[PDB]
Design an enzyme around this catalytic site. Structure first.
Site, PDB file in Angstrom:
ATOM      1  N   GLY A  40      56.750  37.460  26.613  1.00 47.78           N
ATOM      2  CA  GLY A  40      57.173  38.764  27.172  1.00 47.78           C
ATOM      3  C   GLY A  40      55.999  39.701  27.213  1.00 47.78           C
ATOM      4  CG  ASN A 107      58.492  31.808  20.613  1.00 43.96           C
ATOM      5  OD1 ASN A 107      57.298  32.053  20.423  1.00 43.96           O
ATOM      6  ND2 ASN A 107      59.409  32.770  20.750  1.00 43.96           N
ATOM      7  CG  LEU A 109      52.712  31.723  27.623  1.00 43.37           C
ATOM      8  CD1 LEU A 109      52.753  30.892  28.901  1.00 43.37           C
ATOM      9  CD2 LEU A 109      52.266  33.147  27.937  1.00 43.37           C
ATOM     10  NE  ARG A 186      59.589  42.932  22.159  1.00 44.08           N
ATOM     11  CZ  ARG A 186      59.976  42.966  20.891  1.00 44.08           C
ATOM     12  NH1 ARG A 186      59.912  44.096  20.222  1.00 44.08           N
ATOM     13  NH2 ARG A 186      60.417  41.865  20.293  1.00 44.08           N
ATOM     14  CG  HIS A 263      63.649  32.302  25.952  1.00 46.51           C
ATOM     15  ND1 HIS A 263      63.214  31.007  26.141  1.00 46.51           N
ATOM     16  CD2 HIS A 263      62.545  33.085  26.104  1.00 46.51           C
ATOM     17  CE1 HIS A 263      61.915  30.994  26.362  1.00 46.51           C
ATOM     18  NE2 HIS A 263      61.482  32.258  26.357  1.00 46.51           N
ATOM     19  CD1 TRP A 264      63.096  35.679  22.694  1.00 45.96           C
ATOM     20  CD2 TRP A 264      64.040  37.564  21.927  1.00 45.96           C
ATOM     21  NE1 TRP A 264      62.500  36.760  23.345  1.00 45.96           N
ATOM     22  CE2 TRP A 264      63.078  37.913  22.876  1.00 45.96           C
ATOM     23  CE3 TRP A 264      64.787  38.585  21.301  1.00 45.96           C
ATOM     24  CZ2 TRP A 264      62.814  39.246  23.224  1.00 45.96           C
ATOM     25  CZ3 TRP A 264      64.533  39.893  21.643  1.00 45.96           C
ATOM     26  CH2 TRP A 264      63.546  40.213  22.601  1.00 45.96           C
TER      27      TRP A 264
END
Lengths: 282, 282
Positions: A40, A107, A109, A186, A263-264
């Site tokens: 991210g 994780n 990338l 973020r 995904h996390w």
């Protein structure tokens, strides 16, 4: 253990000086483990692995490295295939810290970088734990780009708080984890000049002239070590069907899939993930 | 059209003279199509494609070639990766008959040869129709060797009528197609000195030093032409899960699966197969 007590910097050679930032913990434990975070735009080691670093540090000597283009590591405007580039930087780090053969936990990338490292420098990589990994995945059923990838591309083109929230919401199964505070934090990191510079460079390199380096599903049959693939059943970035070629072709592969998890993996299932990792790595 | 009216011989160069037998039909039709048969020990062009050659010949100039090691083509005791070897022979044939870019129809082992030809001599291959093809398939779910492959290996080790019947019975969905007459005919061809010589050579070469040539699933993303994959749902030699990497990675791929149909698509579904082929090839 704090962000500050753990912060470290190193200068390595990748077509010239390259600054890498990392967090170190568990010094004095015998076995070193390297952590490589997700991709991210405002992602970094310390945010990616907060529910994990302190736990793994009870057992291991943890080096959580900010990959080039993220966190406090150099953010170059130009580079070759990203995973091969980040791999070269890790090799530089390994050489300078005096590491031999070390296990890697990565994780998304970062998983692609772990694998590319394991393929490019076969002797330097031990066991691998890979959570919804890129690179070695090929989505046999899901049309590409997936929703998660599309939503990242949209933020890169139009870096707004709205578009970033939309991206974050397809990272998790429990969308309640996407709070106003997480979105704002973020966003402040993701919309800076450096980050916009980096993001661009990354997506584009997947299609330079060395694009084959990213198609790692064509190579993982060469891997000789045990590899634990870990997937969230509801992963909307690198979906579960992406696990299949690697599960089939990696001789000593295992796969763990968690239902009710996106995904996390390291966040939604942090307890299960930590335990599975500690066992796998001894 | 008979076996005799259609029989042809050609001598080509593959590390020296190599005799190839083939059947020719539909002369005077404008578009040439090459047929490459399956890999059973007593298999040949004329047996493999009897429910097909006469039909396709109404529309096309059909060249059904006996691949090296089968039928009446030379059966050498030694060769490199089989598909690459058979591909070299086809190239020799193309050059000698004055063919340019021709479409290829191949089942099982013959499908692997079509693909290997299409990859090794990219300009010489037009559209491809591939039925339960080897080479470009990788069985993501079925443990290898599959039942069909195992039963072929057993006959090679112990060439009895009993073991051959067992092999033939996992080639079809409707086991009633495996008659005493078919078993005996195939056995008389499969147990000769030449055939035993050939079979050995083939299985072994999949594991020489050029084994990568057989792992075609790593390459089919380079194919630029339309490719029609055709599968029997109940294929027990190269099972349906083997279709997935090729369907995903071949840009202009299509897939047709027939329920109630085994590994011999051209036999169990000969009408449907013929029609699908005629349309696809124009």
């Amino acid at each position: 253990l704090t962000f500050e007590s753990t912060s470290r910097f190193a200068e390595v050679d990748v077509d010239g000086p390259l600054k890498l930032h990392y967090h170190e913990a568990g010094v004095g434990n015998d076995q070193t483990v390297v952590l490589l975070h997700g991709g991210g735009p405002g992602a970094a080691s310390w945010t990616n692995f907060s529910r994990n670093i302190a736990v793994l540090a009870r057992h291991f000597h943890v080096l959580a490295v900010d990959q080039p283009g993220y966190g406090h590591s150099d953010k170059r405007a130009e580079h070759g295939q990203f995973n091969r580039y980040a791999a070269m930087a890790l090799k530089g780090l390994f050489d300078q810290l005096g590491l031999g053969r070390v296990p890697l936990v990565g994780n998304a990338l970062g998983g692609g970088t772990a694998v590319r490292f394991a393929l490019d420098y076969p002797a330097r990589a031990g066991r691998l734990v890979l959570m919804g990994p890129g690179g070695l995945s090929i989505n046999l059923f899901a049309p590409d780009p997936t929703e998660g990838v599309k939503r990242l591309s949209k933020f890169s083109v139009a870096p707004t708080r709205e578009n970033l929230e939309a991206f974050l919401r397809v990272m998790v199964y429990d969308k309640n984890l996407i709070t106003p505070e997480l979105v704002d934090q973020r966003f402040a990191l993701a919309s800076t000049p450096e980050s916009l510079t980096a993001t661009r460079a990354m997506g584009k390199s997947f299609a330079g002239a060395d694009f084959e380096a990213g198609m790692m599903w064509r190579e993982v049959y060469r891997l000789r070590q045990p590899v634990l693939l870990i997937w969230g059943r509801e992963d909307r970035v690198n979906p579960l069907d992406g696990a299949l070629v690697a599960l089939k072709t990696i001789p000593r592969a295992q796969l763990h899939v968690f239902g009710q998890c996106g995904h996390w993996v390291q966040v939604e299932k942090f307890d299960e993930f930590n335990k599975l990792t500690i066992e796998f790595l001894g």
